[PDB]
Design a protein around this nucleic acid. Structure first.
Ligand SMILES: Nc1ncnc2c1ncn2[C@@H]1O[C@H](COP(=O)(O)OP(=O)(O)OP(=O)(O)O)[C@@H](O)[C@H]1O
Ligand SMILES: [Mg+2]
Lengths: 597, 400, 149, 49
RNA sequence: GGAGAGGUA
DNA sequence: GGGTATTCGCCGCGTACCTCTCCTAGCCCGCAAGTATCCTATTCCTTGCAGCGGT
DNA sequence: ACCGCTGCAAGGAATAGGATACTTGCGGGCTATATGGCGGCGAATACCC
């Protein structure tokens, strides 16, 4: 009964930023990469398979595109196990012999350390450094790899969201590769294109979100479908059975007698350790270990290596292996309760088995057929009806228009919710492009770095009802961020007062954030954060803060000032009212500039 | 373990290493074992009578399983490579035994031509006639020539006429299976019943388990397929594993000892027993490898193959590579590391060079010198010291 | 009667079931005239002692891990007032009695006004209390026919 | 609560009290309606019922 | 605005 | 095929007035599940000095 | 007379929680098929010859 529902928060608006990044991207020329016939031919010699023509079609679709000065944002989405990785490696190779810092993002650790091995096995003959960042790397390691990012000693970096901690200033990006893109929302996708607009982007998944599928069908982004499975891989015989340990036991005995390994989906981190022993008396003959995202971030290293070195048959696991881990020995999934899963998730679950000549059985343990809900049911005969090699894009198109693609200039990539026009998207984009290119004004994110951290946990922006015109909203944002006098803040104030009547609360708070930003830059204040419990201010090395009067504050109110670091001052104030918090920082910084020196 | 050995030995030799693709289906299953694998299965059984060398890995379940009675293998199979020393009239009388008709202008199934030096055939299996052109009691050409225009499309090295299944699927074999059904099992009126299904001619999933009813002859224990000088190499153990599997088979048999829909043959019919297995096991000389000390008698040799020391790395100690850095210093023989993967080599390549160790990748374990650090790329799992010749393997798993 | 009709309810897997102990009407939150003024039902909360078993899985059909019991509420039922009226929304309403077909089997005949003949056609309805009706009738050409619902 | 509240609130035989006497309410609580679910209707009733 | 019920001539 | 007979399905079924009560699912917000990141905190390896004994 | 040896202070490193995101599904809170008519007439089969 502790649900505690009905909140509200609209701390940021996204459409302005997404227009800004797209207008920046279309403005900047991309990079006509250099192609090598022969040095890359020796790299082609290295790959120990033979390409399908559809893989080759993807390859020459990528390469002849990436050697052009335009904007390359390509969907190389195919089906699972179709060798989709190697085309990405080929693009990376051709980019990196131009020394252009390919960035690869994966939605988990597991892909990063397996693809670390994959890339590192691939580039064993070339003077290129490939590195991986995660929580498995030590922080000491992280400090120096992010350093040699800036000196550009690392040429290829792969990582989790740990790369998008935004303190990673690269030397020269030319290529971005996203693997299994059907995560991240939108912000984690476009955070890297924010810092470099003209960079090239390669997008890999097996099951795209409907939003990028619609935008692929919009002509904004290129598409290469991959069919023609590369090998002797059949079709994972889907079996949707009501839960029975005997069926389970015979499946496990079938796999162990085959010698292969077992994926056991449980998707319940608390209860999976109980799930281990209750599976253990059912199959005492097996070798089973436990894997999820909540060991002590070293156990799973042993677990995955031991599993990959065949030290145990069965892995009970959560959806942390939904990302596509290959390990071609195993051929049997046991989905304990398939009911609460999307069809893309289901196609992925079928995706990790197979990957080989051997026939892979799939076991979809469900509740009783009336007991399963109709959503889970029609999902189950959806996946059961369509068991075909190369059926992924069919399933993705079925996912589309049943859930509806999200809005074209915002988050929430699935869901209809009455988006804006695609023709309107064209018109708004081109108006953004030529208005931005007009005076060549710097971007939003460029004026986030130059601007001091002035986040005060406020909903403070230009709301949609106040100005529906997102384009001139961005124009106002650029003029407001460009403002270098309080007087031009004032003419902007009377300007919007003229143009739209009364100014709402987020807009006027945005105005006074600009005001405090002005004196913060003017004195030398570098970082000023606040919250309910107080807040923390970071000065410069050359501040206009009185040191003697700073100690005087520390000894007149030790409960309200604590220097913890050289310029790192925590004030502790029960800041409950946002307006009084604004006047707190305003009047305080007024006294501080009364002590300006 | 077979799978492990299949690429363990592939690391450690050059000789042809090949398995037996057995039924991935379970004993008395209700599934198909994926026909093409069976097409790979019998191919092995084509060469098992005639190879003069070669490494074949089979596990105990395969030896437990019975096979085809081999007259079908010599009778309905025209897999044939270029090194088949065979005359002209020999294939004439063999395809006469197969029932083929002599047409010089082959158009229909079961036809062949043989004039001068040329032999042609049109099979019962496919829609393609083939020029053979036998030379001096041997075969020299495999010409995919036209059905009417007599022009070659492609010259082949080995022809593969394998029929689609273990059993003959022809109507006489259908009647034989019906006869053996009415001999052993019973007939009930049901369309879904497999007796009436093969009366309709169709092929159910677990059709392979009613195998011998298609031959009217006992199934071989496949050792009649054997060459005269094989050499059996015991791995793991037998007088536990075979009995264990026998228990599993009988457990499944009595478990599915129900359902006159698909009644099941006794396992003595479709399998060995452990008793007769060990009865046929004295027909061939054998090498038994065990990880224990045999004390003393003739035909034993205990080889000093001692375990590695405590080799482990840890970041808790100040210098993590202490065990290897001191174990190599006290080491007299060559040290082969045998990295599994190639780029993993550099995972050791930037790791031993931290302690100024640069092992060079060699190919053959016989290439080891008296004192040097070398490595393989292969599939080893645990290292050990060969104190007989002071050789050493330090695998990946010797470091974690 | 209704609770013994429905409860106990088994599960589909059959590893547990919910049974019933007793019921008890709560005290009304308001009385008749205050409900009359305010504009709300004169209602009693229903508090039922439900009881859920848990069987053991690996143990055979019929064993007990655990069983729980509590008084749990479901639904506001209006109480009839002291006279015969229900106060439902401040409007006193009366549920008038109905006079309907007693379930059973009823033989009948449309008295010769069909089939242009003057021949009578006897029919028989099996009328359940709750369920599907059943009709038998004679054809004008003496053929017995059935229809469901 | 829905299947009770609908019937006691708005049903075919849950009717408003005729309450302009003692007699009117006491002859309304004793009323025997042949209408309702499971019964006949006002415009589909013959001379005989 | 639509159903449901009751009423008058 | 054609002719008559039965059978199914739609067409209608009074006007005017007054009073009263009652007219819902869906969807999306936030919970659950998962995944990743960011902290303090407290626990835990680990080592140096302090001091205590030994010939 | 001090060397050598262990015990605890220190001090950090890690790891263990607590928050911050992102994906699916679901539930609640609002809020955006019933069985009791009948006669007439006409079109559409049923059957029979
Ligand atoms: N041209 C080819 N011919 C035969 N087999 C191939 C070929 N290309 C790739 N393969 C095999 O198919 C497998 C596909 O795995 P990989 O992860 O490389 O691509 P993918 O599975 O399509 O990508 P994802 O893991 O994102 O689904 C590879 O492990 C490789 O062994
Ligand atoms: Mg009158």
């Amino acid at each position: 009964s502790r649900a505690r529902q009905k909140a509200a928060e609209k701390v940021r608006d996204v459409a302005a930023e997404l227009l800004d990044i797209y207008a920046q991207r279309a403005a900047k020329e991309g990079f006509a990469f250099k192609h090598d016939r022969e040095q890359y031919q020796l790299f082609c010699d290295s790959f120990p398979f033979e390409t399908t023509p559809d893989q080759a079609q993807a390859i020459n679709a990528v390469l002849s595109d990436m050697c052009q000065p335009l904007a390359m944002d390509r969907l190389v989405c195919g089906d699972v196990g179709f060798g989709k990785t190697e085309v990405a490696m080929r693009a990376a190779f051709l980019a990196v012999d131009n020394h252009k810092q390919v960035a690869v993002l994966v939605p988990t650790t597991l892909l990063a350390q397996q693809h670390y091995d994959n890339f590192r096995d691939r580039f064993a003959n070339w003077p290129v450094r490939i590195e991986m960042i995660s929580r498995f790397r030590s922080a000491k390691e992280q400090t120096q790899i992010l350093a040699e990012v800036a000196e550009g000693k690392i040429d290829i970096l792969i990582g989790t969201h740990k790369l998008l901690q935004s303190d990673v200033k690269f030397k020269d990006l030319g290529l971005l590769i996203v693997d299994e893109e059907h995560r991240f929302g939108v912000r984690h996708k476009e955070r890297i294109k924010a810092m470099r607009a003209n960079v090239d982007i390669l997008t890999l998944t097996a099951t795209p979100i409907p939003r990028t599928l619609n935008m692929a069908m919009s002509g904004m982004r290129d598409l290469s479908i991959i069919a023609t499975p590369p090998a002797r891989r059949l079709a994972v015989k889907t079996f949707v059975r009501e839960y029975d340990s005997m069926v389970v036991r015979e499946a496990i005995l079938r796999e162990i007698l085959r010698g292969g390994q077992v994926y056991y989906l449980y998707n319940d981190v608390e209860n999976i350790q109980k799930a281990a022993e209750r599976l253990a008396e059912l199959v005492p003959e097996a070798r089973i270990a436990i894997g999820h995202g909540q060991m002590r971030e070293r156990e799973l290293e042993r677990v995955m290596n031991d599993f990959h070195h065949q030290r145990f048959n069965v892995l009970v696991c959560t959806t942390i292996i939904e990302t596509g881990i290959d390990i071609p020995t195993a051929n049997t999934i046991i989905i304990e309760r398939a009911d609460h899963f999307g069809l893309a998730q289901l196609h992925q679950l079928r995706g990790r088995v197979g990957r080989s000549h051997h026939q892979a059985y799939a076991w979809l343990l469900t509740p009783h057929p009336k007991a399963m809900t109709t959503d889970a049911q029609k999902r189950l005969e959806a996946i059961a009806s369509l068991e075909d090699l190369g059926a992924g894009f069919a399933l993705a198109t079925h996912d589309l228009e049943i859930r509806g693609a999200g809005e074209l200039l915002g988050e929430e990539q699935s869901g209809s919710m009455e988006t804006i026009g695609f023709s309107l998207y064209m018109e708004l984009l081109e108006n953004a492009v030529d208005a931005l290119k007009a005076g060549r004004e710097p971007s939003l994110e460029d004026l986030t770095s130059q601007q001091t951290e002035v986040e005060l946990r406020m909903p403070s922006l230009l709301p949609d009802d106040f100005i529906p015109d997102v384009n001139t909203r961005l124009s106002f944002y650029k003029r407001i961020a460009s403002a270098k006098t309080e007087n031009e803040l004032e003419e902007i104030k009377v300007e919007l007062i003229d143009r739209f009547g009364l100014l709402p609360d987020p807009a006027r708070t945005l105005l006074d954030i600009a005001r405090l930003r002005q004196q913060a830059q003017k004195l030398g204040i570098r970082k000023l954060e606040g919250n309910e419990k107080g807040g923390v201010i970071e000065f410069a090395e050359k501040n206009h803060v009185n040191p003697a009067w700073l100690i005087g504050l520390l000894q007149k109110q030790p409960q309200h000032y604590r220097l913890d670091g050289p310029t790192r001052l925590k004030f502790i104030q029960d800041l409950s009212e946002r307006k009084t918090r604004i006047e707190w920082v305003r009047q305080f910084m007024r006294e501080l500039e009364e002590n300006a020196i | 373990n077979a799978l492990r050995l299949h690429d363990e030995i592939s690391q450690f030799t050059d000789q042809m290493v090949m398995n037996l693709a057995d039924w991935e289906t379970l004993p008395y299953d209700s599934f198909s074992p994926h026909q093409d694998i069976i097409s790979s299965r019998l191919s092995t059984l084509y060469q098992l009578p005639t190879m003069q060398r070669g490494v074949l890995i089979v596990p105990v379940n395969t030896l437990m399983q019975r096979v085809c009675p081999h007259s079908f293998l010599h009778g309905h199979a025209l897999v044939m490579k270029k090194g088949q020393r065979l005359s002209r009239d020999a294939l004439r009388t063999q395809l006469d035994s197969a029932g083929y008709r002599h047409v010089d202008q082959v158009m229909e199934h079961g036809e062949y031509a043989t004039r001068g030096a040329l032999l042609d055939l049109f099979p019962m299996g496919s829609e393609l006639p083939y020029r053979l052109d036998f030379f001096d009691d041997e075969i020299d050409s495999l010409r995919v020539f036209d059905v009417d225009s007599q022009r070659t499309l492609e010259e082949v090295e080995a022809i593969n006429l394998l029929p689609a299944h273990e059993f003959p699927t022809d109507k006489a074999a259908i009647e034989l299976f019906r006869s053996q059904w009415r001999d052993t099992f019973e007939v009930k009126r049901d369309p879904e019943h497999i007796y009436q299904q093969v009366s309709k001619g169709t092929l159910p999933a677990g059709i392979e388990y009613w195998q011998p009813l298609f031959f009217s002859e006992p199934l071989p224990p496949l050792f009649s397929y054997f060459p005269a000088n094989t050499l059996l190499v015991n791995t793991g153990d037998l007088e536990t594993s075979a009995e264990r599997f026998q228990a599993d088979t009988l457990a499944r048999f009595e478990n599915r000892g129900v359902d006159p829909m698909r009644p099941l043959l006794p396992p003595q019919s479709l399998w060995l027993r452990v008793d007769e297995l060990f009865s046929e096991l004295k027909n061939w000389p054998r090498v038994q490898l065990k990880t224990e000390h045999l004390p003393t008698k003739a035909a034993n040799a205990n080889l000093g193959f001692q375990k590695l020391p405590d080799l482990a790395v840890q970041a808790q100690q100040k210098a993590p590579l202490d065990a290897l850095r001191k174990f190599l210093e006290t080491f007299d023989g060559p040290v082969v590391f045998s990295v599994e993967s190639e780029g993993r080599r550099e995972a050791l390549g930037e790791l031993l060079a931290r302690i100024k160790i640069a092992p060079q990748r060699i190919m053959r374990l016989d290439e080891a010198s008296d004192r040097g650090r070398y490595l393989m790329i292969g599939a080893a799992e645990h290292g050990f010291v060969d104190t007989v010749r002071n050789l050493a393997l330090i695998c990946e798993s010797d470091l974690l | 009667a209704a609770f013994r009709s429905v409860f106990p309810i088994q599960s589909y897997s059959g590893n547990s079931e919910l049974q019933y102990v007793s019921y008890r009407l709560g005290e009304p939150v308001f009385d008749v005239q205050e409900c009359q003024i305010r504009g709300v039902t004169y209602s009693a909360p229903l508090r039922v002692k439900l009881r859920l078993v848990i069987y053991e899985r690996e143990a055979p059909e019929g064993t007990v891990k655990d069983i729980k019991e509590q008084e749990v509420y479901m639904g506001e039922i209006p109480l009839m007032t002291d006279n015969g009226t229900f106060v439902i929304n401040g409007t006193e309403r009366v549920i008038v009695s109905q006079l309907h077909r007693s379930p059973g089997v009823f033989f009948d005949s449309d008295k010769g006004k069909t089939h242009s003949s003057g021949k009578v056609l006897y029919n028989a309805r099996i009328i359940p209390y709750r369920g599907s009706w059943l009709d038998f009738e004679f054809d004008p050409k003496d053929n017995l026919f059935v229809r469901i619902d | 609560s829905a299947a009770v509240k609908e019937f006691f609130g708005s049903s075919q035989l849950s009717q408003f009290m005729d309450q302009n006497n003692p007699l009117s309410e006491i002859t309304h609580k004793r009323r025997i309606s042949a209408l309702g679910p499971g019964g006949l209707t006002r415009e589909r009733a013959g001379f005989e019922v």
